[PDB]
Write a protein that binds this ligand. Structure first.
Ligand SMILES: NC(=O)c1cn([C@@H](CO)CCn2ccc3ccc(NC(=O)CCc4ccccc4)cc32)cn1
Ligand SMILES: [Zn+2]
Length: 349
């Protein structure tokens, strides 16, 4: 069945979008919340999309399940644990996983997300709990995991906390800072809370990625590159819109975190068009293949590989260079990055 039967690298996946239905129900019941279902299968049917939707439509998906995990400590550790399990089934030898700590928390955060009564779970120990779950998963399932911590567009006040959390927990497991959630809010790349967070990340050596370009213009890409100093782009589809920018990113060997299946389901790509990744294939761009939200998009990594092999004529050779590009563009220290490279060179021959 699987389009690509070798080990794989993945750089772009959200933890809060990669929970098993079954364990949301488990915590729905056991805490009180009660979902719009009580069977795993129907749960995935309504909390999981299969044709494009608007943003409010999208966000209410989170409004369903997040109150069931956020706040509960053992929930937070278990989803980090089960994320590694899920990934071992995908054949991934190395993954970076991202999330917003604040969104899993029910105290020391204004506003309190998900409506949610107060309590005592702060952002700081959310990240310790996640990174316990993750370290255990690594040990039991033999996938290597690191994590990225997301800033949120609409909430520049969280952002100095995020860089500080990145520093406190560096190497183990957290390797980078991200910026997520609605790149359409005007001027959001340039909100002072975000820019000074990213400037702190330069100063102290935390690695940087930015979501720019999925649903927004090439201008928001440009700000991510020139003002936020990204090392990578999540998505970056719209840099095509601006050809000098595109060419520049080609020379600098910028890495696009591509999420094929997602981009259909979000509206970012319309089916009757050039998919941006085929252009990236033809141009020999430094890009990767990623799942984004396997919960919400009813998908595994093989969904993404499959789609590009069926409908876009991707071949096995391109699959290889892409995962190599992803290993090179990882936020691993260089010794550990050479080790990963070596594993992959052998596996691939
Ligand atoms: N794929 C994602 O965008 C995503 C974001 N998360 C969470 C962090 O890990 C945060 C969820 N979240 C909270 C507020 C918020 C605002 C916007 C978005 N995402 C977008 O706007 C992405 C673009 C988009 C447009 C329209 C439909 C779907 C998606 C996520 C948001 C999980 N998955
Ligand atoms: Zn994403």
């Amino acid at each position: 069945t699987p389009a690509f039967d070798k080990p794989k690298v993945e750089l772009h996946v959200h933890l809060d979008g990669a929970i098993k239905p079954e364990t949301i129900l488990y915590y729905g019941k056991r805490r009180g919340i009660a979902l719009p279902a009580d069977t795993p299968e129907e749960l995935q049917n309504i909390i999981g999309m299969d044709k494009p939707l608007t943003l409010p439509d999208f966000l209410a998906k989170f409004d369903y399940y997040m109150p069931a995990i956020a706040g509960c400590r053992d929930a937070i550790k278990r989803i980090a644990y089960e994320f590694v399990e899920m990934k071992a089934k995908d054949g991934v030898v190395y993954v970076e996983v991202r999330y917003s700590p604040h969104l899993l928390a029910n105290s020391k955060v204004e506003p309190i997300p998900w409506n949610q009564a107060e309590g005592d779970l702060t952002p700081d120990e959310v990240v310790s709990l996640v990174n316990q779950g993750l370290q255990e998963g690594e040990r039991d399932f033999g996938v290597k995991v690191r994590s990225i911590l997301c800033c949120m567009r609409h909430q520049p006040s969280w952002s100095s906390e995020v860089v500080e959390l990145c520093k406190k927990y560096r190497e183990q497991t957290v390797v980078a800072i991200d910026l997520a959630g609605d790149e359409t809010i005007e001027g959001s790349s340039l909100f002072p809370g975000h820019v000074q967070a990213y400037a702190e990340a330069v100063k102290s050596g935390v690695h940087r990625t930015v979501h720019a370009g999925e649903v927004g213009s090439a201008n928001v890409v440009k700000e991510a590159v020139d003002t936020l100093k990204t090392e990578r782009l999540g998505h970056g589809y719209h840099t095509l819109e601006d050809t000098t920018l595109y060419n520049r990113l080609r020379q600098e060997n910028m890495h696009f975190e591509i999420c094929p299946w997602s981009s259909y389901l979000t509206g970012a790509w319309k089916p009757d068009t050039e998919h941006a990744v085929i252009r990236f294939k033809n141009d020999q761009v430094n890009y990767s293949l990623n799942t984004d939200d396997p919960l919400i998009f009813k998908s595994t990594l093989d969904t993404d590989y499959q789609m590009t092999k069926k409908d876009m004529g991707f071949t096995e050779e391109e699959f290889k260079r892409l995962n190599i590009n992803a290993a090179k563009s990882s936020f691993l220290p260089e010794d550990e990055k050479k080790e990963l490279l070596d594993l992959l060179y052998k596996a691939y021959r």
